[PDB]
Amino acid sequence: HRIRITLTSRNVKSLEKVCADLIRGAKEKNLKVKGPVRMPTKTLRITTRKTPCGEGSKTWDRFQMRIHKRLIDLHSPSEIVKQITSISIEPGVEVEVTIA
């Protein structure tokens, strides 16, 4: 089966740690696994005035929100995919599994 697992999160270190854990499980289970494909990141920019009133020098704030997304493919039945995704998950990392 063509099984695709999508991981999208905000932090980068916990995302890399859980991706390393998943690829380590795929390597120790001895099955064909695609590499960690790194999609381009998206930034959410909101620019707003600092002062609440209309007095002062025209100073502005710059907010950002980096979003990192990975996807790793597998060749296995579904129960292996669920039992390998439901092990040692991180709170700040979303996991999302579909089959084509």
Binding site: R10, L44, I46, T48, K50, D61, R62, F63, Q64, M65
Partner: protein
């Protein structure tokens, strides 16, 4: 006819049809990404949402 003339004016559009979800003020709304706040409440609540200053 007060039951029909209480809210007979349409509010399908305009800036009076929008409101902040914190203080309900119809000025300086942030309609990007569906925050739907004013700018002051956004600066108050920006850190715990995930928006940080790096640039």
């Amino acid at each position: 006819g007060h039951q029909q003339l209480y809210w007979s004016h349409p509010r399908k559009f305009g800036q009076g049809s929008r409101s902040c979800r914190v203080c309900s003020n119809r000025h300086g709304l942030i309609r990007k990404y569906g925050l739907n706040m004013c700018r002051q409440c956004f600066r108050q609540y920006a850190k715990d949402i995930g928006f940080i200053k790096l640039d």
